[PDB]
Design a protein around this nucleic acid. Structure first.
Lengths: 88, 69, 155, 65, 50
RNA sequence: GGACGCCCUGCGGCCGCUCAAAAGACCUGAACCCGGCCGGCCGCCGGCCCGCCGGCCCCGUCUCGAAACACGGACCGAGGAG
RNA sequence: GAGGCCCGCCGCGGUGCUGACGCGCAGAUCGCUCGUCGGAGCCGGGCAUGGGGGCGAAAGACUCAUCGAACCGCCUGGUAG
RNA sequence: GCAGAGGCCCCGGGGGCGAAGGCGGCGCGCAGGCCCCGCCGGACCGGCCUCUGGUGCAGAUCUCGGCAGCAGUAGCCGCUACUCCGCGCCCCGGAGGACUGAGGGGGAGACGGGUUCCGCGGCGCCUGCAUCUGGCCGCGGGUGACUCGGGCCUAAGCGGCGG
RNA sequence: GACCGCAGCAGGACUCCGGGGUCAGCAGCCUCUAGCGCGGGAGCGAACGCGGCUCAGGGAAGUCGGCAAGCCGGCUCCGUA
RNA sequence: GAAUGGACCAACGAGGAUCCCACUGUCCCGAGCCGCGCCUCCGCGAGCCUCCAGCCUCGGGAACGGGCGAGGGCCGGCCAGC
RNA sequence: GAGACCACCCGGCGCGGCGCUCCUGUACGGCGCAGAGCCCUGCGAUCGCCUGAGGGACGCGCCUGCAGAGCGCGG
C-alpha cells in the first residue's frame, strides 16, 4: 500500500509542456516551469549544475541571426558601420 | 469516391489555420463551383480534412473529373 | 571454418545447420546416439524416438533425466525422447545422405554416420521478472549441429 | 479461414450477439468472400447465415409452483 | 484524452508521423548499414510527454 | 558483397565461385568456458622411463599467534593505487 | 418512525490463523475469519499549506517504495589517529 | 621489463622474400626476462647511448566486459473446462459440454495512454508452450456537430492594481 | 481487458445502466441476454505439502493460552434472571 | 490515594484474565479419502551461492578441522526424499 | 500380489459378456375394490400388488465374441 498499491492511483499530469522550453516541466497547478523559469522573463539558470547549462544554451540551437551577423562582421558590415559612424 | 457519387461531397486536405467560411470561398473560386456545407476534422496526423458538400444543382462527379479525382 | 571434421579424401557426405532453435544438451544426446549407425537404421531409430518406442540415451547431460525401461541395454539407466531434436537431427541426416549419394555415388546401406559435432551457440535473451522487483535472464541454449555420413562402416 | 469479420458484421446486421450468429457449415468459402455488410445481408437472405432464438429459460415450472 | 486540446494533439501527432523506419532507398544511397531509426517508439514500452 | 551445378515441400544444405585471402558481415582473434576426435588417469616438488616411492594444509591479511570453525577471494581478460 | 442504535450486502477498514507466500502474482499480495456499514461515514475532481518547514483524533506518524528532519545538483575527490 | 623523445645503426638499421601480434616448441639467464624456430597473421618494428614518465597486479564486499558449475535444475499449481470432426493451430467454422452470473470475464463513458482503431498481407521480433494467432511486424486507410462537450459564467482559490 | 506499478504483474484505478427463479433481500446458489474458455500440454495416482472431507470410545486429559476446528444460527409461537 | 483526579461498571469492546455448560482430531492415537502441486514425459527455462575440495574417529593446534599427525572406511556416476 | 521414475514378480495379455456372489432396499411402468378431500367427471401427496424387485460391482467361476507370442532391438 505504501508502494505498488498506491502507484495505481497515479492518473494525473502535474507537469505539462512549457511554451518557452517545450519540456514536461510546466507545473499546471502552480503555473510555472521547473526548468525554463517561465513565466519569468529571465531564463532560470543555476551555476550549481553546468550540465543543465550545457543542455539549453547558445549553440544547442540554430543560432541563425547570430551566425549570419558574426560572418557579416568578418566580411562587409564593419565598412557599412564606418559610413553610419561618419553619419551626416 | 462513393461520397462523390451519393452525397455530392469532395474530401480535401486543407491548411489547418483555414476556417469553414474560407474553404467554402476557396473551393468556390478555384473550382468555379457552389458549396452548400463544409464539415471539417483535424486528422490524428495533424492535417485538417474538409468534407465539401457541393450544391444540389452542381454534380460533384463533373467537379471531381475536372480536378482529376 | 564451421566444419570440425577433416577427412583426408574419405568420400564423406556432410550437412550442418547453424543457430538451431533446439536444446544443445538434447540435440547433443540425439546426435551421439546415431553415431556408428547405418543411415537406414538411424532414420528408423529417430522415428521410433518420435513415437516413444525407442529412447535417446543421455550419457553427458543426465542430471534431471529419469531412469527409463527402454534404456535397459543402452549403457546408461537414464534417457529421454527429445522430439524437437529428433526432427532437426533427421533433417540434417537427410541432407548429408543426399549429399553423399549424389556426389560420391553412394547408397543408403553403404553410408554410416561416421562423425558428429554439436557446439553451443549465442542464445536469444528474454527477461523473467523475479520477486521484490527483480529481473533475471530467460535465455535459449541453441546448437551448431554438424553431421557427416561416410562410406566407412567405422572399422 | 478467419470468419471473424463475417461474424462481427453478421451480428451487426442481425442485431444479435456474435454468440447467436450461426454460419452454414457447408459454405465456409461463400462466407469467406463476403467482406461487406451488403454481401453478408445477401447471404442472410440465402439462409447460409442466421440468428438463433434467445433460448430464454422455461417459466412453466415457475407458473405451476 | 478523447477530450484533448489541439496543442497537445499536434505535438503527439508529430510523434505518430515520425515513428517511421529509414526508407530502404535512403539506406542504399548513404550506404548506412545501420537501418534502425532508434528514435522509433512503441506505445506499450514508451512514455512520451514524460 | 558470393558464379554454376546438385538435392530440397520448403527452410536451407552441398559442390564450389569472386578475391592475394574469404577477410562472407566482417582486420588480428587471446584467456575463461565448451563440443568432436585423440592419448592418458589425474595437484605441486624431487628421483628415475614415468607410475611408483618420498616430501607437501589456502593464499592475501591484520595479528603474540591463521589450515583455521577469523576476513576477502567462482573463473578469465582489460583498467586499477606515493 | 427517533437514534454518532443493532444484524447484515457493496463499500471502507484490517482482527486472528502468528494460514498461504516469503528465489512472491505482489519492494506487503492472497485465502478464510473478521471491525464497521446513516455516521466524527465513504469516494472522485479542483484548490490551499513546503523542508528544521508543512500537516498531525499524537503513532515522532505522514509529506510520491525516502522522514527522530524529503528529494535533486553543488560546496565535495568534505574529514577519518 | 614498458611506453614515448634526441642520437647512433661504414654506401646507410630490420620489413609483402612477410612487421607487430597470437599459438606451440627449443635454447640462454640465479631470476626478472630474453632469443630463436615452426605455424597463424597481414604493415610496421627495433638493438645501443642520452632523455622523460599517467611505467610492471592475485587480492581492494576492487571497476567494466565476458562467462562457468549449479542445470536440462527450481519453476511455467489465481480466475471450475475442455472435447469431437472439418487445412485443423491455443486459428476459424459447426456440434457438444460449461463458465463469468446484471456491484458481470456485459454494454458504455471520465482520466491516463497516443494509434494501440480498421482492412490486407506476414511470422523475422514478441506472443514466458505453441501459433497458420495477435494489442506484434509490413502496407494502405480511419475521428465530419447551430442543437453533445469545450469555449462562456462564477466557486474554493489564483492572478492584476498608482503604489 | 491498451492506465499506473521495470512487464500482456492474484496489486491498484472514478462513474453510468442493471433481466429470471428461490429468497426479507441488490445476500448466497443456479440461470436469460451479452461475453467467453487466462506464462502450455500429456501421463501417473509415492512420500510429503497446500486447499478440503469423515472419523469408534473419551471429550481439552492437548497447549503459554480452546490456537485451530466444531457446536450454534432462518422463521413462528411460548417463555426469560 | 483524591481533575499528577479518588471510588464506582449500567450499556458497550477484533482489548487483558479466570471458570462453567455446550462442542469438537486440541489430544489419547492416529486412520481413510478428494482435488492440486510433487513425480515422469513433450515444449520452454532461470536465481542464490562458490579458495580449493567434499567420509570419519582421536590428538595437537587462534583451546570445536574436509585438508595437519595417527588410525578406521571408501568402485564411479545418478534419482526421490531429508 | 509390485511401483515416485525405475526396479520387482509374472505373461498369448486384455476387452465385454454370462453365471455365481455381494451391495442397496423393492425400479420404470401398468393395475387397483387404497387415499384426506375437492369440484367436476376428473384431480389428488401418497399407498398396495407385480417386486428381497430393479440398478450396480474393482470379488469368484466360465467363454457363447473380438482378440492375444515382432520380420523391433541387442546378442
Amino acid at each position: 500500500s505504501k508502494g505498488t498499491a498506491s502507484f495505481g492511483k497515479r492518473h494525473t499530469r502535474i507537469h505539462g509542456s512549457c511554451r518557452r522550453c517545450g519540456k514536461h516541466s510546466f507545473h499546471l497547478q502552480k503555473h510555472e516551469c521547473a526548468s525554463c523559469g517561465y513565466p519569468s522573463a529571465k531564463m532560470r539558470r543555476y551555476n550549481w549544475s553546468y550540465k543543465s547549462l550545457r543542455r539549453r544554451t547558445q549553440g544547442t540551437g540554430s543560432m541563425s541571426h547570430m551566425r549570419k551577423v558574426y560572418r557579416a562582421y568578418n566580411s562587409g558590415t564593419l565598412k557599412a558601420n564606418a559610413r553610419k559612424y561618419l553619419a551626416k | 469516391t462513393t461520397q462523390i457519387e451519393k452525397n455530392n461531397t469532395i474530401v480535401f486536405i486543407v491548411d489547418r489555420r483555414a476556417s469553414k467560411p474560407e474553404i467554402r470561398k476557396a473551393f468556390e473560386t478555384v473550382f468555379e463551383t457552389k458549396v452548400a456545407r463544409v464539415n471539417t476534422l483535424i486528422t490524428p496526423l495533424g492535417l485538417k480534412k474538409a468534407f465539401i458538400r457541393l450544391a444540389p444543382d452542381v454534380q460533384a462527379m463533373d467537379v471531381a473529373s475536372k480536378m482529376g479525382l | 571454418v564451421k566444419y570440425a571434421f577433416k577427412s583426408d579424401n574419405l568420400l564423406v557426405g556432410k550437412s550442418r545447420r547453424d543457430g538451431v532453435k533446439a536444446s544443445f544438451k538434447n540435440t547433443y544426446s540425439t546426435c551421439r546416439a546415431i553415431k556408428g549407425m547405418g543411415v537406414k537404421r538411424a532414420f528408423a531409430y529417430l522415428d521410433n524416438v518420435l513415437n516413444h518406442k525407442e529412447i535417446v540415451p543421455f550419457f553427458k547431460f543426465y542430471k534431471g533425466v529419469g531412469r527409463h525401461s527402454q534404456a535397459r541395454g543402452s549403457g546408461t539407466d537414464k534417457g529421454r525422447w527429445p522430439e524437437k531434436s529428433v526432427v532437426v537431427v533427421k533433417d540434417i541426416l537427410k541432407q548429408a545422405v543426399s549429399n553423399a549419394k549424389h556426389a560420391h555415388k553412394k547408397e543408403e546401406d553403404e553410408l554410416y554416420v561416421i562423425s558428429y559435432c554439436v557446439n553451443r551457440a549465442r542464445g536469444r535473451r528474454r527477461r523473467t521478472f523475479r520477486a521484490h522487483g527483480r529481473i533475471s535472464k530467460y535465455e535459449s541454449q541453441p546448437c551448431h549441429v554438424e553431421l557427416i555420413v561416410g562410406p566407412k562402416p567405422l572399422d | 479461414a478467419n470468419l471473424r469479420l463475417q461474424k462481427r458484421l453478421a451480428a451487426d446486421v442481425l442485431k444479435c450477439g456474435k454468440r447467436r450468429v450461426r454460419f452454414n457449415p457447408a459454405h465456409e468459402k461463400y462466407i469467406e468472400q463476403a467482406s461487406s455488410r451488403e454481401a453478408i445481408r445477401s447471404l442472410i437472405e440465402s439462409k447460409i447465415i442466421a440468428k438463433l432464438d434467445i433460448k430464454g429459460s422455461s417459466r412453466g415450472r415457475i407458473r405451476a409452483r | 484524452t478523447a477530450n484533448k486540446t489541439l496543442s497537445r494533439k499536434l505535438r503527439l501527432a508529430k510523434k505518430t508521423k515520425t515513428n517511421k523506419n529509414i526508407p530502404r532507398w535512403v539506406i542504399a544511397k548513404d550506404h548506412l548499414k545501420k537501418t534502425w531509426n532508434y528514435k522509433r517508439h512503441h506505445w506499450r514500452r514508451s512514455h512520451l510527454k514524460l
